[PDB]
Design a protein around this ligand. Structure first.
Ligand code: ATP
Ligand code: ADP
Ligand code: MG
Ligand code: MG
Lengths: 574, 616
C-alpha cells in the first residue's frame, strides 16, 4: 500500500548497489536457464538432424558449463539478497527504536509496551522477509518472461510473436485475478483475527460468561464470526481457484499454437525442427516462474498491515521537547510551585486535574491523597515533565518546568512510580542506576535506608543476587523497596514517591520514612498515597477529589476541616 | 506427542463425511485432470513428430521405400543418419501432411481446454467441502467450551486450551485442504508421469529418479549444517526482544535516571549482532533452492544429451523426447514441495487429535429444569466439605446462614478458601458431603442458568471483552436503555473516571492508551453486576485495586443500604468490613469465629489480632 512503499523505498535506499547486483545476477541466472533449451535445440538440429554424433557430447559440455554458471550466480544472488534484506530491517528497527525512545509517557503509553515491542522486532521481520523473498524469488517471474521473449527473439525471431502475445495475456489475466483477490484476501485476514479474538475472550472469561448465563448470547456472537469468516474465505478461494487453471491454459494454448504456426515455418524451410523444443521449454519455464511467484504473493497484504503499524509509530511526533535556550541554574534545589495547573487528555469531557494550585517548600514533605483515578499519578508526572500542563504552570525554584533542560531536571529528581520496574541483572546494577558510580558502602547504606538490606545480605552472592527480567523473582514489598533504594543512591533534591509504600506494612513503611527523613532531611519529598498512616507526619497534606483540590493542611487541621479527608480516614479505622 | 496416528487420521478423514459427494467429486475430477497433463505432452509430441518425419523425409528421393533409403544412407557412409531414418516412420518424397498435424493439435487443444475446466471445478468444489467441515468443526468446539466444567479450564496450562481451539483448528484446515488438493495430485503426477516415461525410455527415466536421492540428501545436508545458525539467530533475536521488552516496559525509568544512551548503545550492540547472525542463517537457509535446481539441471543435461544421443540412433523418436522433456519438468516439480506438504500433514494431524480429545473429554452433570426462584434470599451452608484434588481438604465442615436482608462479610488470610466458597455458591464446583441451600431449595437441584442469574458476582480478577466500556457494562443486562446503564455506571463510580477519558463510554477496552487503570477495570466489572439487579450479590475482593474509600462507598450503597438484598463481601482490607453485620472469620478451610464487629472484637480472637496489624 502507501505506507509499505514509502517505508520500503526509504530504508532499502542505502542498499541500492546490493540490489543492482542481485538484479544483474538473477538476470544471468535466468538467461542461463533459458539457454539450456537453446543448446538442446542446437543438439536436435546440429546433432540428431545430422548423423554427427560427436556434436551432441561436445555440445552437452557447453551445457554443463551453462548449468554451472547458472548456479554460481544463483547463490551469489541470494548472498547479496540476504545481505540487503538484513541491512533493511537492521536500519528499520534501529529507526523504530530510536523514534520510540523519543516519545513521552503519554505517547508511549498510547501504543503500549507489548504492542510497541511486537512492532519493532517481529513486525520489522515481516517486511524483512518480504524484501528477501521479492528480490530472490519474485523478480524471476518478470525476468523469466522478458528474458524468454528475448531468447525467442534470438532464436527464430519470426515465431517470436507468439511470446509477445502470450506473456502480456498471461500477466494481464493474472493481474485481473490478483486485483480482485487482494481485497477479499485482506478482509479475510482481519476476520481470522476477529474470530480468534472472540475465542480468546470466551476462554479468558468462561467464568463470568457463565455467572451471567451468557452462553446464549455467546455462540450467537461466535456463529456470526464463524459464518462471516467462511463467507469471506469462500469467495477469496473462488478467485484463487482461477489462478492455476487460467495460467496453465494460456501456456498450453500458446504451446498448441506454437506447433501449428511453427510447423508452417518448418515446412516452408525457414525454421529448424529443434526450435520447437526450445520454445516449449521457454513457455514451460515462464509458467513455473509465474506460478510460484503468484502463489507467494500472500505476504504483501500481511506485510502491508505490518508496515501500517511501523508507519503509525514513525509518524508520531513528540510534544515534550527540551526547549531552545533552557535555563540552567547552579543547582535545582527543589521548591515545587504548582500554580493553577490543569491537565486534560485531548477530547475528554472532564480534565484529570483542574485548577490545582499548591506549593511545597525547599526542605519539607507534602503528601497528596485522593481516590482512584483522581489525578495523583498525573501530578507526579507533571512535576518532572513526563506529562505537560495544558492551562497552568509547574515551577521549581521559581522557573517554569517547561523552561528547563529536561535532562538536568531528571538528574535532580529521584522518582519511584506506581508501575515500578527492575531491570534484569544484579541488584547492584539496579542501584548503580541512580548514581552510576556508587561504591558498596553507598549501596548498602541505601539498602539499609530502604529497609532492604536484610533480604539482600541474607544471600550467598551478596549484593549480586540476580534479578529476573521484570524483577519478578521478588515479592511486591521487596521489588518496591529496591525501587526506593535506587532512588536513595541518587541523593536527589526532590523525591517523588508515587504509591511507593502500598505493599509495605505500616511497620516497615514507618521505618523507611523515618530513615528517609533522617538522611535526606533537606530534600523536598512528595508522597502520593491512598494510605493515611503514611500521611500523618507530612508537613502538609493536600486532598484531591474529582481533579480539584478539596483541602490543604496537616493531618489534624484537615481531619476536621475536610469532609472527604475524614471520610477517607474513617474507611481505614483511624 | 501424537500418541496415535491411525485412529486420528481415520476420524479426521471422515469428518469429510457429511458431504461425501463433494469429496468424491474432487478426487475423480482431479484424476481426470492428471490423466490429461500426462497424455497432453504425448499427443503434442506426436504432432511435433509428424513434422520431423516430413521434413527429413521429403529430401529423400521420391519413389524409394523406407528400407531402400536406409540402405542408400548406409552405402554412402552415414552410419548414424541411416539409423535415424530407420527408427522413424517416414516415406521418401512426402511432405508434412498438415491434415494429421491439424487433427492432432485440435485434439490436444480441445483436451487442454477440458483439463483447465476439471481443475477449476475441482478447486471450486474442494473449497466448498473444506470451508464447510471447518464451519462445523469450529462450531462444535464452541458448543463444547460451554459444556465443560470449570475444573477443565483451570487445571490446564495458561495458553493450552486457547491455542487448541484457535491454532490447532487452523492446522486442521491447512491439512484438510493440502492433502486433497496439493498432495493427492502431486502423487498422481509422480506415479503417472513416471509410468508414462517408463514407456518412452527406461534409461532416461533412470537419469530422472536419481535426483530424488540427490535432491533430498542435499536438502538435508544444508538443513543440518545450518542448524548451528538457527540457534545463533533464535537466541540472538531473543536477546534483542528481551532488551526491547524491558526498555519499553521500564521506559519512564530508562528515561528518568538518564539511561537513554546506555540503553540505546546496548541496542546498537544487540542489533548489529542479530544482523550478522540472521544473514548467516538466511543465506544458508536460502541456498537450498539454488541447490535443488542445480541437481535438477544436471538431470536435464543428462536427458537432453543421452536421449538426444538416443534419438540420433533411432531408438526413440524426436516426438517422444519432446514429451520426455515435458515430463522431466513435470515430475521434479512436485519434488521440491514434499518436505512442506508432509511436515504440514504431520503437524496438521498431530494438532487434529488434540481437538478430538477436547471434543471427547467429559462434559458437566446434565443440570435440572427446576428454574431456581429467589424472592427473599437466604443462603445457608450445611457441613460443606469441598476439595479440589482428593485427599487435600479446602473446605472442612463449614456452615453459615444469611438472614434474607443482611450482608455477611467473609474475612481471612489468603488460601483460607474464601474464593473457593464462591465457586461453591455459584456451583462452579460440586460440593462434597454437605448441603448448600439458597432460600430453602438445594442449589444442587436447580437449573444453573437460573441460579447464576438470580445471583451475581464480582471476582478479584476482572474480565473485559473486546469492546467499549458501554458494551462491557451493558453485558450484564443487554435489554437495558442507555439511561439504566449509566445509572449502574454511576453507583459503581465508573461515571467519575469515564468523563476524563478522551471518548468515554466508547473508549475501547482492548484499544485504549492505558487509560483504564487496574482498579478501574474492577469498577466497570462492579457496574456490570449491579446492572442485572441481582438478589444475591457476592463481592469477592473485586474492590481491592481501588481506593479504600471508594470501596467503603460501593459496599455501603450496594450492600448495607439495600434492605432487599443479601450480599457476601469477601474483603482483605477489613476496615471497610467493620459495621457490616455478621463478619465471618475463616482460616485454613473453616470458620474460626463469627459475629458482628463489637461482639467479635471484644472477645479477643483472631479478628481482634487482625484489627491490630494495620494499627500496630
Ligand atoms: N494514557 C491515558 N490516556 C487517556 N486517559 C488516561 C490515560 N491514563 C490515565 N487516564 C485517565 O486519567 C485519569 C488519571 O488518573 P491517575 O492515574 O492520575 O489517578 P491515580 O491517583 O494515579 O489513581 P490510583 O490511586 O489508582 O493510582 C484516570 O482517571 C484515567 O482514567
Ligand atoms: N482450581 C484449583 N485447583 C487446585 N487447587 C486450588 C484451586 N483453587 C484454589 N486452590 C487451592 O485451594 C485453596 C483455596 O483457597 P482460595 O479459594 O484461593 O481462597 P482465597 O481466595 O482466600 O485465597 C488455596 O490455598 C489454593 O492453593
Ligand atoms: Mg497512579
Ligand atoms: Mg481470592
Amino acid at each position: 500500500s502507501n505506507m509499505l512503499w514509502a517505508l520500503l523505498r526509504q530504508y532499502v535506499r542505502p542498499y541500492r548497489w546490493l540490489l543492482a547486483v542481485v538484479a544483474v545476477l538473477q538476470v544471468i541466472s535466468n538467461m542461463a536457464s533459458l539457454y539450456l533449451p537453446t543448446v538442446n535445440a542446437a543438439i536436435i538440429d546440429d546433432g540428431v538432424a545430422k548423423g554427427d554424433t560427436a556434436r551432441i557430447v561436445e555440445l552437452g559440455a557447453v551445457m554443463l558449463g551453462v548449468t554451472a554458471l547458472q548456479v554460481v550466480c544463483a547463490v551469489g544472488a541470494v548472498f547479496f539478497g540476504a545481505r540487503a534484506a538484513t541491512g533493511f530491517g537492521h536500519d528499520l528497527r534501529a529507526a523504530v527504536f530510536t523514534h520510540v525512545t523519543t516519545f513521552s509517557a503519554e505517547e508511549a503509553g498510547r501504543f503500549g509496551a507489548a504492542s510497541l515491542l511486537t512492532r519493532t522486532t517481529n513486525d520489522v521481520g515481516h517486511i524483512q522477509q518480504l524484501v528477501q523473498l521479492t528480490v530472490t524469488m519474485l523478480i524471476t517471474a518478470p525476468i523469466m518472461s522478458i528474458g524468454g521473449i528475448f531468447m525467442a527473439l534470438h532464436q527464430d525471431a519470426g515465431l517470436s510473436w507468439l511470446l509477445l502475445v502470450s506473456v502480456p495475456v498471461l500477466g494481464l489475466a493474472n493481474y485481473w485475478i490478483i486485483r480482485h483477490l487482494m481485497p477479499v484476501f485482506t478482509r479475510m485476514q482481519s476476520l481470522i483475527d476477529g474470530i480468534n479474538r472472540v475465542l480468546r475472550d470466551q476462554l479468558s472469561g468462561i467464568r463470568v460468561i457463565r455467572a451471567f448465563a451468557r452462553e446464549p448470547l455467546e455462540r450467537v456472537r461466535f456463529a456470526e464470526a464463524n459464518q462471516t469468516l467462511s463467507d469471506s474465505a469462500l469467495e477469496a478461494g473462488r478467485w484463487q481457484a482461477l489462478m492455476l487453471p487460467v495460467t496453465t491454459l494460456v501456456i498450453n494454448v500458446s504451446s498448441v499454437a506454437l506447433i501449428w504456426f511453427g510447423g508452417l515455418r518448418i515446412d516452408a524451410g525457414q525454421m529448424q525442427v529443434g526450435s520447437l523444443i526450445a520454445f516449449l521449454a521457454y513457455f514451460m519455464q515462464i509458467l513455473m516462474a509465474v506460478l510460484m511467484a503468484t502463489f507467494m504473493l500472500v505476504i504483501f497484504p500481511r506485510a502491508a498491515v505490518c508496515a501500517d503499524r511501523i508507519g503509525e509509530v514513525l509518524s508520531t511526533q513528540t510534544a515534550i521537547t527540551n526547549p531552545a535556550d533552557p535555563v540552567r541554574p547552579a543547582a535545582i534545589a527543589g521548591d515545587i510551585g504548582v500554580h493553577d495547573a490543569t491537565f486534560c487528555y485531548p477530547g475528554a469531557d472532564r480534565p484529570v486535574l483542574q485548577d490545582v494550585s499548591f506549593t511545597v517548600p525547599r526542605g519539607t514533605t507534602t503528601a497528596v491523597v485522593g481516590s482512584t483515578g483522581s489525578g495523583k499519578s498525573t501530578l507526579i508526572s507533571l512535576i518532572c515533565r513526563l506529562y505537560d500542563v495544558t492551562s497552568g504552570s509547574l515551577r521549581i525554584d521559581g522557573v517554569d518546568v517547561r523552561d528547563l533542560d529536561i535532562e538536568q531536571l531528571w538528574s535532580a529528581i529521584g522518582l519511584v512510580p506506581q508501575r515500578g520496574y527492575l531491570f534484569s541483572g544484579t541488584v547492584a546494577e539496579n542501584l548503580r542506576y541512580g548514581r552510576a558510580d556508587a561504591t558498596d558502602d553507598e549501596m548498602w547504606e541505601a539498602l539499609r535506608v530502604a529497609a532492604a538490606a536484610d533480604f539482600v545480605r541474607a544471600h550467598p552472592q551478596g549484593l549480586d543476587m540476580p534479578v529476573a527480567q521484570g524483577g519478578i523473582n521478588f515479592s511486591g514489598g521487596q521489588r518496591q523497596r529496591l525501587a526506593i533504594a535506587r532512588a536513595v543512591i541518587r541523593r536527589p533534591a526532590i523525591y517523588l514517591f508515587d504509591d511507593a509504600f502500598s505493599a509495605l506494612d505500616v511497620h516497615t513503611d514507618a521505618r523507611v520514612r523515618d530513615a528517609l527523613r533522617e538522611v535526606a532531611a533537606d530534600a523536598t519529598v512528595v508522597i502520593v498515597s491512598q494510605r493515611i498512616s503514611t500521611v500523618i507526619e507530612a508537613d502538609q497534606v493536600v486532598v484531591i477529589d474529582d481533579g480539584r483540590v478539596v483541602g490543604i493542611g496537616t493531618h489534624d487541621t484537615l481531619l476536621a476541616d475536610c469532609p472527604i479527608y475524614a471520610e477517607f480516614a474513617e474507611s481505614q479505622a483511624l | 506427542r501424537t500418541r496415535d496416528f491411525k485412529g486420528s487420521a481415520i476420524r479426521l478423514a471422515r469428518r469429510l463425511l457429511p458431504q461425501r459427494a463433494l469429496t468424491l467429486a474432487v478426487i475423480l475430477l482431479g484424476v481426470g485432470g492428471i490423466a490429461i497433463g500426462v497424455i497432453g505432452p504425448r499427443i503434442l509430441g506426436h504432432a511435433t513428430d509428424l513434422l520431423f518425419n516430413g521434413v527429413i523425409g521429403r529430401e529423400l528421393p521420391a519413389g524409394l521405400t523406407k528400407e531402400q533409403a536406409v540402405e542408400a544412407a548406409r552405402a554412402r557412409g552415414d552410419g548414424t543418419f541411416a539409423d535415424l531414418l530407420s527408427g522413424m516412420d517416414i516415406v521418401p518424397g512426402q511432405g508434412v501432411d498438415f491434415g494429421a498435424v491439424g487433427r492432432t493439435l485440435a485434439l490436444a487443444l480441445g483436451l487442454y481446454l477440458v483439463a483447465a475446466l476439471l481443475v477449476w471445478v475441482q478447486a471450486r468444489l474442494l473449497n466448498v467441502t473444506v470451508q464447510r467441515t471447518m464451519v462445523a468443526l469450529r462450531a462444535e468446539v464452541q458448543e463444547k467450551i460451554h459444556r465443560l466444567p470449570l475444573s477443565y479450564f483451570d487445571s490446564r496450562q495458561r495458553g493450552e486450551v486457547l491455542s487448541r481451539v484457535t491454532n490447532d483448528v487452523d492446522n486442521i484446515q491447512n491439512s484438510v485442504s493440502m492433502t486433497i488438493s496439493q498432495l493427492l495430485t502431486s502423487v498422481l503426477t509422480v506415479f503417472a508421469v513416471l509410468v508414462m516415461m517408463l514407456t518412452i525410455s527406461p534409461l532416461l527415466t533412470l537419469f530422472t529418479v536419481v535426483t530424488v536421492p540427490a535432491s533430498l540428501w542435499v536438502t538435508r545436508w544444508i538443513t543440518r549444517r545450518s542448524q548451528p545458525l538457527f540457534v545463533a539467530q533464535w537466541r540472538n533475536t531473543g536477546r534483542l526482544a528481551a532488551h526491547l521488552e524491558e526498555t519499553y516496559s521500564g521506559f519512564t525509568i530508562v528515561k528518568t535516571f538518564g539511561h537513554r544512551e546506555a540503553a540505546a548503545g546496548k541496542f546498537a550492540e544487540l542489533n548489529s549482532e542479530t544482523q550478522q547472525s540472521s544473514f548467516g542463517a538466511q543465506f544458508f537457509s536460502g541456498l537450498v533452492s539454488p541447490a535443488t535446481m542445480f541437481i535438477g539441471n544436471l538431470s536435464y543435461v543428462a536427458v537432453a544429451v543421452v536421449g538426444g544421443l538416443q534419438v540420433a540412433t533411432g531408438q526413440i523418436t524426436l516426438g517422444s523426447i519432446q514429451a520426455f522433456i515435458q515430463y522431466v519438468r513435470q515430475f521434479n516439480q512436485p519434488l521440491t514441495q514434499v518436505a512442506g506438504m508432509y511436515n504440514t500433514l504431520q503437524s496438521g494431524i498431530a494438532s487434529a487429535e488434540r481437538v478430538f480429545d477436547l471434543l471427547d473429554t467429559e462434559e458437566e452433570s446434565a443440570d435440572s429444569p427446576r428454574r431456581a426462584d429467589v424472592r427473599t434470599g437466604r443462603v445457608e451452608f450445611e457441613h460443606v466439605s469441598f476439595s479440589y484434588v482428593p485427599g487435600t481438604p479446602v473446605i472442612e465442615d463449614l456452615s453459615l446462614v444469611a438472614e434474607p436482608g443482611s450482608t455477611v462479610a467473609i474475612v481471612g488470610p489468603t488460601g483460607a478458601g474464601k474464593t473457593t466458597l464462591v465457586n461453591l455458591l455459584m456451583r462452579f464446583y460440586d460440593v462434597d458431603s454437605g448441603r448448600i441451600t439458597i432460600d430453602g431449595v438445594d442449589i444442587a437441584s436447580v437449573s444453573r442458568e437460573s441460579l447464576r442469574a438470580s445471583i451475581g458476582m464480582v471476582l478479584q480478577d476482572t474480565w473485559l471483552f473486546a469492546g467499549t466500556i458501554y458494551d462491557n457494562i451493558a453485558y450484564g443486562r443487554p435489554d437495558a436503555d442507555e439511561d439504566e446503564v449509566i445509572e449502574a455506571a454511576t453507583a459503581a463510580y465508573v461515571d467519575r473516571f469515564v468523563h476524563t477519558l478522551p471518548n468515554g463510554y466508547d473508549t475501547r477496552v482492548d484499544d485504549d492508551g492505558g487509560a483504564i487503570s487496574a482498579g478501574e477495570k474492577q469498577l466497570i466489572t462492579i457496574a456490570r453486576a449491579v446492572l442485572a439487579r441481582p438478589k444475591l450479590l457476592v463481592l469477592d475482593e473485586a474492590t481491592s485495586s481501588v481506593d479504600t474509600r471508594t470501596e467503603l462507598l460501593i459496599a455501603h450503597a450496594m450492600a448495607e443500604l439495600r434492605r432487599d438484598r443479601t450480599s457476601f463481601i469477601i474483603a482483605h482490607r477489613l476496615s471497610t468490613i467493620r459495621d457490616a453485620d455478621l463478619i465471618l472469620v475463616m482460616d485454613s478451610g473453616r470458620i474460626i469465629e463469627r459475629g458482628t464487629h463489637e461482639e467479635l472484637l471484644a472477645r479477643h480472637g483472631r479478628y481482634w489480632e487482625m484489627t491490630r496489624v494495620h494499627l500496630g
